[PDB]
């Protein structure tokens, strides 16, 4: 297991997200679904010039999986996935400019719901999650698990669990007072409201 420090600016964003009083927390789900949809668009487009990129799975979809026993909500896609370099460096590097503009917009009147307009909506996960685990598989790399409970650091390890073929699973370990996002009716409400026009089938799994 390798442990890394977030860039100062990303650490600052995450603390803002964790510490700021802001009741409209449901926006995290829209942001993660939007990210999944962008990742599905990417693999679809790449597959037009190299059909073999779909050898790791033809199905292009999003699954939402609540689990009350583990207190987790998982967002799963069969999109392009992320490489080790994406997890450790590339995505954070790109998020730096968006983060700066976002925190400038907040002290100038914007609110946290606009986070996705700055390309850094992934970090809205920390509105509801005390820990985020991301399991991911890109065609050009191995399966990895990224994980962070914030506080300035994250880990990356090669993942030994079940192979996923290609795509990304974002596992939200929910805060004690955010278990409403495990309820079927609440999830349905949020998806209908914010994600009605996404172009991939979204399947909300039911609990056993």
Interaction site with Mg ion (CB under 5 A) = 6-7, 10, 92
Binds 102: which of ligand MT0, Mg ion, none (CB < 5-8 Å by kind): none
Q: How many residues bind ligand MT0 (CB under 6 A)?
A: 8
102 near ligand MT0 (CB under 6 A): no
Determine contact, residues 120/106, Cβ cutoff 8 Å.
no
- Dist. CA 57–CA 99, nearest whole Å: 34
Q: Which long-range contacts (CB under 8 A, 24 or more apart) does 188-193 make?
A: 190/26, 190/29, 190/30, 191/29, 191/33, 191/64
87 near ligand MT0 (CB under 6 A): yes
The Cα-based distances of 63 to 33, 72, 88, 107, 202 in angstroms read 9, 14, 25, 36, 6
| Ligand-binding site membership of 28 (annotated) | no
- Dist. CA 79–CA 48, nearest whole Å: 14
| Ligand-binding site membership of 122 (annotated) | yes
Cβ proximity to ligand MT0: between 2 and 50 the closer is 2
Give me the helix-helix angle, 91-106 and 8-19, nearest 10°: 50
Q: Which stretch binds ligand MT0 (CB under 6 A): 51-59, 89-97, 175-183, 188-196?
A: 89-97
Cβ proximity to ligand MT0: between 97 and 203 the closer is 97
Binds 7: which of ligand MT0, Mg ion, none (CB < 5-8 Å by kind): Mg ion
Q: Which residue is nearest to ligand MT0 (CB)?
A: 122
Cβ proximity to ligand MT0: between 95 and 190 the closer is 95
Binds 134: which of ligand MT0, Mg ion, none (CB < 5-8 Å by kind): ligand MT0
- Dist. CA 205–CA 208, nearest whole Å: 10
Cβ proximity to ligand MT0: between 120 and 191 the closer is 120
Cβ proximity to ligand MT0: between 88 and 185 the closer is 88
Q: Which residues bind ligand MT0 (CB under 6 A)?
A: 35, 87, 91-92, 95, 122, 134, 146
């Amino acid at each position: 297991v390798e442990t890394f420090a977030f860039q100062a600016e990303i650490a600052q964003l995450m603390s803002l997200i964790i510490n700021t009083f802001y009741s409209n927390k449901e926006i995290f789900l829209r942001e993660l679904i939007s990210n999944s949809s962008d990742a599905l668009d990417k693999i679809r487009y790449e597959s037009l010039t190299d059909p073999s990129k779909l050898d790791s799975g033809k199905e292009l979809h999003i699954n939402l999986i609540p689990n009350k026993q583990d207190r987790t909500l998982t967002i799963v896609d069969t999109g392009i996935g992320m490489t080790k370099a994406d997890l450790i460096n590339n995505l954070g590097t790109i998020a730096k400019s968006g983060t700066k503009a976002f925190m400038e917009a907040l002290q100038a009147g914007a609110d946290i719901s606009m986070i996705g307009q700055f390309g850094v909506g992934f970090y809205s996960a920390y509105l509801v999650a005390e820990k985020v685990t991301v399991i991911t598989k890109h065609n050009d790399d191995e399966q990895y698990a990224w994980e962070s409970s914030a506080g300035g650091s994250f880990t990356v390890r090669t993942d030994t669990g079940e192979p996923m073929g290609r795509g990304t699973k974002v596992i939200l370990h929910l805060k004690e007072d955010q278990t409403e996002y495990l309820e079927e009716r609440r999830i349905k409400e949020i998806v209908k409201k914010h994600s009605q026009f996404i172009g991939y089938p979204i399947t909300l799994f039911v609990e056993k």
